[PDB]
Amino acid sequence: HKIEKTTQKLSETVRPRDMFIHDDGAHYKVDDNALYEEIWSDLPHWDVKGIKDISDQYDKAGFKSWFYGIGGSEAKLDLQFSDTIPIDIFQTLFKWSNQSFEYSSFDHILIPFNETKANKKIYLVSYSKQLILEVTVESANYRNIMNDLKNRQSNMPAFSLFSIGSKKEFLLPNKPLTMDKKEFVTESIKTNTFKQALFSDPSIVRENVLTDGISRLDVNLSQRQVQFQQLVQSTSYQTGELIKKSQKYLEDTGSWTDHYQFFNINDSQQLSFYIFMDQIPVINSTAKPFGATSAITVQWANDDILSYKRPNYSLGTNSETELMGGSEVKMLLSKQTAYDTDKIDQIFLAYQLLEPVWAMKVNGKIVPITKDL
């Protein structure tokens, strides 16, 4: 079973895009990575006592004040994901025995500060649907962890909510941010390496475009992209399962050339995984286009993978610039003409092919919010 490189745990593949502390009209980004890693690694050990849906306990205004620790509402640690994560996934990651709410999914896990009783509460939240699952839990380290957070809070980058478009608001810096830049010179993978690992039997592949009569492997060097296809589209797999299957598949084929994380799943169930550097998404710049796609894309069939598209190179080993603050981001998107801000779904930090930049998700498309306006 030819492989290609290293091993990756599910908790490494699907995890929060970032972490924020919301409280009293303020918002602080948890930028210390070791702290992010500490929270993420300890969370799965918080033993679940019970789970209950409490969505009906809040109206629109209530939900928002609570979610962001407005006024008297306790401050909240917000673990933001890139897509609504199926509850099936959280159950696996945390070894939960729970089996109800089988159809729910969430894009945020929030943890309130000041939980003193033995029974503490965390919440699985699907923001736009305002759905909330209250998870009662026991934690040996909650107190220590929430203590560090609260103490390092003051020196955390300050973010606020900017209303861009007329339908949503986006977490963005109060002022510009200073972040390190690029590096380069990939590693690249030989077409033969993909062949030996992707075909169940490389001895019969022929014809660079290679096939074994029932599976094509296209390596386009100019696009720095490899493609592996086989003709249906799964029907027996629910979102959670497709994600699990993708994890196992990328693991069994040694696809983890770099640290890849699940980003989201398509309307047509195409799962996207991106290369992450410093817990930051690595995307492709608009102009000076390096490659054609920097994300691993997986499409499943009922008993086989339909298509797998990925980079034919790797990175990850070893300047300085300023990224707009948000008022600068708002004003820009305010007069760019290209896209309609009412269509912006998400705005987030991303390295560009590696330069810190703000990226937006507009109608599935992911565009670098740069002066290339």
CATH (domain of 301): 3.30.310.160
CATH number, position 174: 3.10.450.310
- CA 346 – CA 171 distance, rounded (Å): 10
Are 295 and 357 part of one and the same domain?
no
Phi first, then psi: what are they for 343, rounded to 5°?
Answer: -105, -5
Q: Is 340 annotated as a binding residue?
A: no
Are 289 and 336 part of one and the same domain?
no
Are 89 and 140 part of one and the same domain?
yes
Q: Domain ends where: 301, 318, 335? A: 318
Are 202 and 148 part of one and the same domain?
no
Q: Which amino acid is at 293?
A: T
Residue 4 lies in a domain: no
E-state strands within 167-304: 168-173, 177-180, 209-211, 216-220, 225-229, 260-265, 270-277, 280-283, 295-300
- Within its chain, how far is the Cα of 5 from the centroid? 22
Does the CA dihedral 283-345-162-279 come out positive or negative?
Answer: negative
Are 195 and 89 part of one and the same domain?
no
CB neighbours of residue 10 within 10 Å? 16
What is the pairing mode between strands 280-283 and 270-277? antiparallel
CB neighbours of residue 176 within 10 Å? 14
215 contacts 228 by C-beta, under 8 angstroms:
yes
Q: Is 139 annotated as a binding residue?
A: no
- CA 105 – CA 28 distance, rounded (Å): 25
216 contacts 198 by C-beta, under 8 angstroms:
no
SS3 at position 217: strand
Q: Is 56 annotated as a binding residue?
A: no
Residue 2 lies in a domain: no
Domain extent, residue 194, equals 184-318
**Residue entry with tokens 């509850």:** 87
Are 161 and 115 part of one and the same domain?
no
Residue 216 lies in a domain: yes
Are 174 and 112 part of one and the same domain?
no
**Residue entry with tokens 């998870």:** 135
Residue 172 lies in a domain: yes
Q: Which amino acid is at 270?
A: Q
Question: Determined by which method?
Answer: X-ray
Buried b (16+ CB within 10 A) or exposed e, 186-213: eeebeeebbbebbbeebeebeeeebebe
Residue 137 lies in a domain: yes
Does the CA dihedral 97-102-108-112 come out positive or negative?
Answer: negative
At what resolution in Å was this solved? 2.3
Residue 3 lies in a domain: no
Are 223 and 301 part of one and the same domain?
yes
- CA distance readout (Å), 260 to 204, 206, 357: 31, 30, 19
- CA distance readout (Å), 348 to 60, 80, 170, 233, 255: 24, 11, 9, 31, 25
Residue 1 lies in a domain: no
SS3 at position 124: strand
Are 28 and 151 part of one and the same domain?
yes
Q: Is 291 annotated as a binding residue?
A: no
Q: Is 25 annotated as a binding residue?
A: no
Number of domains the chain is built from: 3
- CA 262 – CA 338 distance, rounded (Å): 28
- CA 217 – CA 319 distance, rounded (Å): 38
Phi first, then psi: what are they for 42, rounded to 5°?
Answer: -90, -30
Residue 219 lies in a domain: yes
Are 49 and 125 part of one and the same domain?
yes
Are 14 and 152 part of one and the same domain?
yes
- CA 305 – CA 228 distance, rounded (Å): 9
36 contacts 278 by C-beta, under 8 angstroms:
no
Are 309 and 373 part of one and the same domain?
no
What is the pairing mode between strands 209-211 and 216-220? antiparallel
- CA distance readout (Å), 23 to 3, 66, 68, 90, 136: 47, 9, 6, 26, 22
- CA 352 – CA 146 distance, rounded (Å): 33
